[PDB]
Design an enzyme around this catalytic site. Structure first.
Site, mmCIF file in Angstrom:
data_model
loop_
_atom_site.group_PDB
_atom_site.id
_atom_site.type_symbol
_atom_site.label_atom_id
_atom_site.label_comp_id
_atom_site.label_asym_id
_atom_site.label_seq_id
_atom_site.Cartn_x
_atom_site.Cartn_y
_atom_site.Cartn_z
ATOM 1 N N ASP B 73 -23.524 -97.000 50.376
ATOM 2 C CA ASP B 73 -22.859 -97.872 51.325
ATOM 3 C C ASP B 73 -23.177 -97.454 52.746
ATOM 4 O O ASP B 73 -23.459 -98.303 53.617
ATOM 5 C CB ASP B 73 -21.351 -97.886 51.070
ATOM 6 N N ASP B 89 -20.576 -93.253 49.594
ATOM 7 C CA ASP B 89 -20.296 -94.421 48.768
ATOM 8 C C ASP B 89 -18.789 -94.622 48.599
ATOM 9 O O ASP B 89 -18.039 -93.646 48.418
ATOM 10 C CB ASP B 89 -20.941 -94.205 47.388
ATOM 11 N N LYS B 91 -15.740 -96.029 46.429
ATOM 12 C CA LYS B 91 -15.392 -96.289 45.047
ATOM 13 C C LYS B 91 -13.921 -96.634 44.983
ATOM 14 O O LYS B 91 -13.105 -96.047 45.711
ATOM 15 C CB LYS B 91 -15.630 -95.022 44.218
#
Ligand SMILES: [Ca+2]
Ligand SMILES: [Ca+2]
EC number: 3.1.21.4
Lengths: 233, 236
Positions: B73, B89, B91
């Site tokens: 990301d 990232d 999540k």
DNA sequence: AAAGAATCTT
DNA sequence: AAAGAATCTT
């Protein structure tokens, strides 16, 4: 007409309002991203209240899936017409366009698989399709008009799934029915490849997962019709 | 450090604000769904400004992927040391009242240095996971004056920043989409980093050599113990 | 558990 | 095209 009023409401809302960020109860605003992952979620939320208003206006009850992995986004029904429910699903793509029209391995091959109600009780399967042309801090309420919008020109249509379905899969490992690959207007006008909803169902119901397999059956509509002509062999 | 600051930043932001809906430029607000597909998107957007803020405070360039199926990301790096990039990232998962995350694909960039990743895998020196855990909790629209009335789509939300390898498990997180599975533990173990791998080397090797189906790995390894036995046998 | 449901890229 | 990349349910 429910359909008439729904598409008018959606077409109208789209035209009059532009989403630009997520807001907190405290009033803080976070800008949006240009990923279809983000925008598709947005377009569904934008659609929810409108679908609800029109449905209620027509005496319809709107039900959304309780558990994830269940089709469709919205199930509309009159208590008096329980076996004539209508399925409405939101789909998004960006910029000819194409959509993934859901799996061909769940509810279309199994009446009760991955669907809120048995495929039996639905007499219509509509797709509210959204297409957008793709284009880092927070903002206060006093800045709503200054927040850069993550898209250029969103368009929306309302069509029957079987009518905009194509003959080539929309995805591989996740086995989705693919739509026609065409311009927005072709979707509005319903210029598909199938001659009936039955041909549509039969075709995706016997479509083989890999080209290896459908190399010995059918890979497109012409071949499917030849397969049909000879005896499904 | 960047890491401590970021973690401190994320916790404070999540404490102070409750995302409740999407707002139009015209001021109309549409409420939020309470499904993780919706919430994942929300939380990711909520994190972006904080992450960018702190990164800037440390001299890091933040780059998001130009293409969709591309990890991670956020890619942070100083232009002076481009070979030392940090992957972050976002999540998300939910609790009803132990939890688990899908930690990414095991057949992409981890097996191929340039597959589905913004920058070659070898240019990243750290892979962080910001994980959001919300406890699962309208049909109308609102105006800016009704913010306190819009229903919150979560009963509560917690966030952690942890090394991906540290929280990784030995069972896959998804089948057809070949995702690495995390430890199935209580939120505290994610923060504490109580994983199962001995090191990131062991983590990477385990997932780089993990077979996609039971049959296949049935003749290799299904878990960490068997993997360790496979190593003993000479990677056979 | 493991397997398989729920838009985009080369 | 193709095939395979990008959290949930049992
Ligand atoms: Ca939905
Ligand atoms: Ca949908």
């Amino acid at each position: 007409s429910l359909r008439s009023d729904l598409i008018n409401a959606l077409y109208d809302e789209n035209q009059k309002y532009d989403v630009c960020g997520i807001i907190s109860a405290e009033g803080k605003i976070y800008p949006l991203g240009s990923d279809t992952k983000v925008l598709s979620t947005i377009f569904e939320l934008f659609s929810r209240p409108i679908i609800n208003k029109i449905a209620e206006k027509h005496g319809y009850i709107v039900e959304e899936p309780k558990q994830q992995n269940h089709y469709p986004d919205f199930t509309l029904y009159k208590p008096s017409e329980p076996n004539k429910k209508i399925a409405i699903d939101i789909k998004t793509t960006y910029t000819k366009i194409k959509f993934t029209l859901g799996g061909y391995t769940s509810f279309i091959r199994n009446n009760t698989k991955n669907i809120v109600y048995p495929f039996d009780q639905y007499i219509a399967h509509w797709i509210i399709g959204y297409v957008y042309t793709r284009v880092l801090k927070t903002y206060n309420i006093n800045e709503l008009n200054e927040i850069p919008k993550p898209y250029k020109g969103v368009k929306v249509f309302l069509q029957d799934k079987w009518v905009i379905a194509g003959d080539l899969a929309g995805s591989g490992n996740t086995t989705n029915i693919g739509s026609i690959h065409a311009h927005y207007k072709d979707f509005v006008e319903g210029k598909g490849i199938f001659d009936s909803e039955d041909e549509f169902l039969d075709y995706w119901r016997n479509y083989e997962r890999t080209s290896q397999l459908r190399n010995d059956k059918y890979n497109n509509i012409s071949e499917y019709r030849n397969w049909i002509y000879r005896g499904r062999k």
